[PDB]
Amino acid sequence: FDILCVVRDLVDEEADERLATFVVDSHVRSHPENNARQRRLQRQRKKEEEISPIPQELLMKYIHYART
Amino acid sequence: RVTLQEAPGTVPPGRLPRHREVILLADLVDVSKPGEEVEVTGIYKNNYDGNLNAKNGFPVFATIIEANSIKRREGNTANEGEEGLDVFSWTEEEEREFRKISRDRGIIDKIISSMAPSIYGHRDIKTAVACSLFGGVPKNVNGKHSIRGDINVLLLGDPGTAKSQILKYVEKTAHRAVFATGQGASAVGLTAS
Amino acid sequence: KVITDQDLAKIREVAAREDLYSLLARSIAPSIYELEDVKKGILLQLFGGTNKTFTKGGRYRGDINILLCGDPSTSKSQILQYVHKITPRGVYTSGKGSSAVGLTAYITRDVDTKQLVLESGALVLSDGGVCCIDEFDKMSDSTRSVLHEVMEQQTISIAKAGIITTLNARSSILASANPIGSRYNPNLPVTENIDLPPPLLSRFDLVYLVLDKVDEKNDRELAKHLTNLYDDVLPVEFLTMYISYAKEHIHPIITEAAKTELVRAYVGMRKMGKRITATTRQLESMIRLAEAHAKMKLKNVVELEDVQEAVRLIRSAIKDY
Amino acid sequence: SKFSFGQATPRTLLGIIRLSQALAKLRLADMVDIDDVEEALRLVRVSKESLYQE
Amino acid sequence: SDEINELKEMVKDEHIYDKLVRSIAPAVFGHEAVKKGILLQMLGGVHKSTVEGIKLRGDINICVVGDPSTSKSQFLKYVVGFAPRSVYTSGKASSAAGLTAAVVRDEEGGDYTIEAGALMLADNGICCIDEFDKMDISDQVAIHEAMEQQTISIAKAGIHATLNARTSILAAANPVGGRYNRKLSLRGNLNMTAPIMSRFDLFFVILDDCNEKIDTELASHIVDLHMKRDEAIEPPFSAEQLRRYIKYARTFKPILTKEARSYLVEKYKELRKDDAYRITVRQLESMIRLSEAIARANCVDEITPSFIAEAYDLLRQSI
Ligand SMILES: Nc1ncnc2c1ncn2[C@@H]1O[C@H](COP(=O)(O)OP(=O)(O)OP(=O)(O)O)[C@@H](O)[C@H]1O
Ligand SMILES: Nc1ncnc2c1ncn2[C@@H]1O[C@H](COP(=O)(O)OP(=O)(O)OP(=O)(O)O)[C@@H](O)[C@H]1O
Ligand SMILES: Nc1ncnc2c1ncn2[C@@H]1O[C@H](COP(=O)(O)OP(=O)(O)O)[C@@H](O)[C@H]1O
Ligand SMILES: [Mg+2]
Ligand SMILES: [Mg+2]
Ligand SMILES: [Mg+2]
8 A cells, every 4th residue: 555544533722623514515415406508507507616726526636637 | 149137127026036037139149248228129028838738837927128228227327317328328419519519718626516416515525526427648658668557546445425425426417327335346346246 | 635603602601611711621532640830821822912003103013932841751742742733724844844934934946837936934824823843953053043033033034045035933933952961950940951042041931940860750651651542522613613713803902900900919929039030021012811711711901810821821830041 | 060961851761662662673572672672772771881980 | 285384383482492301202212312312314415415425424423322121122113113214123133144244155156145234224324223332243344334334345256346325323232231230431331442442423421210109100101101092192293293294304405504513613723632531533523513403403594603612511411
């Protein structure tokens, strides 16, 4: 194994607060309720922009191109 | 010719699968490999079968599919929202966009930050995942020495530290991915049998 | 190849007899000597309790299960053979036995016809009757799980070969067991001797420990009986017909006096023991036994006598336990 | 003690009467005699105990 | 039209929430705490998927521990015969399939084939396991992915597949000893390990007392069940009414308000502090799941802090 990543779960006020806030925000963001196809794509892009600097599909294409 | 069978995921639980025979003409051959999950666009055709009639006792016609297009659905359940036969293929404009993105100084930081955006932290598990996804360059020195060019990663952590979600994201992003569980995998289910 | 009005009159005349219980107990096992309690329990199991089909509640089983464990010298398989000869419906099986058809439903191939056929097991074929299992000790894990499911849900479910079906198995069980060694050791508890899971052993309403203790008087009397083999008794056919009629027509119902007696008996049994002398299962078992006893007398009402008889049979088995 | 093969049971009885009946058949005399029963008992003893004690 | 009027009448009731709890498994006596858990499990939580294909579970798992003869099985029996999709099984499964999937090959030529399991068959339903404390090793490892990832992954000779297992597990287990030892903690009384214990949203413990009054009350109730038959059971709402209302509630998809979000973070912080290891990140989502289910019971599309508080008590009771 080239890289080993050990993950520890420790109780910390600041870390717990930040993680809980992010998890709650993500859960609210993914709520199903929260041209027509173009409008859907635009709202999906707006939702994605919050948490990722690069579009996911563009990222997959980038990875494939770089590998090939 | 291939034997198309209902995928385990879509068949009702505990019921026998149904199958059809798909005919692949020129330029379509070898595109689908056994054990894969594919979506087949074709023509639904029927023909007279004597043995069928004989066996059934009724005038029943055999059925086949003449493949028009094949889309590799294996490991692409979460990518069904896109369009095109291949979602990992690119156009010339997209290649220019890739070059423009790459020329940026902070490309690596953005790439790492874009790995599993829904997972809060673990910037050390995202860096390793990105490195594994991109991989290295295999080498063959003078045709005698072979050096591996892939990166393996192991996550040894606490029960609720978002490891399975990371694996699922890697499966979604990778061009060809396979997911297996601990005891669900046999010594020859991996490798070859 | 090599029920009438008179039959009903004869049945009613027999029922009117005062010593009907003893007569039936004797007629069940003429050749078995000095096992009155076991014979009474077997009779009550044969008659069975009342099946309740509840709206809002579900299904409450009226069957009675009896376990015949103890020393190998005593007669235990002959009792099962007699029960088979008497019960209108039932099958004979031994755990881990290739000769028997099987205890669980399975999917097989019809050699004759080269066709796929779903064959029902012994428990399914015993629906509404008594299933006698000769050798409970040696049994497959799978078979034990099937037995647990049958005694819990009363249905067998199979989801193999592309078939998803559930088969009714509303049948009573009368199993026999032997100790781990050459004899049953009184010092150790019953659970250790019988070598069965505590869960599966706690589902039998009545548990009988027939032990061949070496007693001069008992040995002499048994020898006299056996050598002589070389109180009226009813024919087997009439007994089977009587059981069939009682199980088909009579349906007893609990009354206020029966309710009071049952509540008082359960409270008293609980107060005996901290050690738990009895559980709620010991109340449903008493209810079933009282209903079966009422069935035996061709009564549509459960009275105080039936409850008194039930508490006594249940208590004697608990005392062994 | 642990030396005994097993406790006598009514099965041992039935076997004893079976052996006595077989010996009577051998004798060609209808009535089973005490000698036949004694012979069966001694056969039962010498089948196991005779060699075990050695 | 008549049914609609009944539906509107039920939601108009002020004490609707209490009545539903009291109308679950009326045969069982004096176990309102367990009934509330089963009702919430049936309603379930909103299933959500992130913007990159990561799935967030929305099903509630309940484990019931109790001494023998405590109506543990009765709860599973009622759920089996009431919920639309459900399967009754036991940890010591007879079938080669078991809880999870298994592979069977017709002898010779014929290739390996997939045989459905308990969890598979109960897809989009509730799988009731009679004895969770006796599951096979294979199943114990296998059930790790099913309870959280909602999938079953198999890679055997010539066959590889991912099987949907979107089910809610309602399991009943016995204490490791003969009876529940109050002195020891819940972890000690249970053979379950930390990973599995975290995947369960709620825990319920049923004890066996010996008080005369309790025994008399329980003993009489059972007798009247056989005596009065259906007349003995008079729940506020019949099975048909409850079934229709539950289906109506599942249509709602409540959201989290701004006040609830801030309150939600604070409660998780307090819960983690007391732990310092039953508490983890999975419990933060469990409160979200329970909060949605409680909102559905009230037929309300916005989760208020009061609903969040109610979820907090239920998790604390499990500790
Ligand atoms: N009360 C009794 N009356 C008559 N015979 C009896 C009695 N008790 C024991 N026996 C005799 O004991 C022998 C027991 O035979 P049986 O076939 O019932 O054994 P079993 O219980 O199946 O034995 P094992 O556990 O060794 O398999 C029979 O010969 C039976 O005659
Ligand atoms: N609170 C109760 N109300 C009514 N009946 C009860 C109650 N508690 C126990 N019982 C009775 O207990 C009997 C036996 O219990 P049940 O079959 O539900 O499983 P259990 O013994 O608790 O579980 P297990 O099989 O895991 O030991 C049931 O028939 C039920 O009538
Ligand atoms: N760092 C994190 N950021 C966001 N969500 C998290 C994080 N850690 C855990 N979670 C949540 O908790 C759950 C963890 O389950 P999972 O990671 O599948 O278990 P395991 O770690 O055993 O594979 C996930 O559903 C995930 O949404
Ligand atoms: Mg995991
Ligand atoms: Mg026998
Ligand atoms: Mg149970």
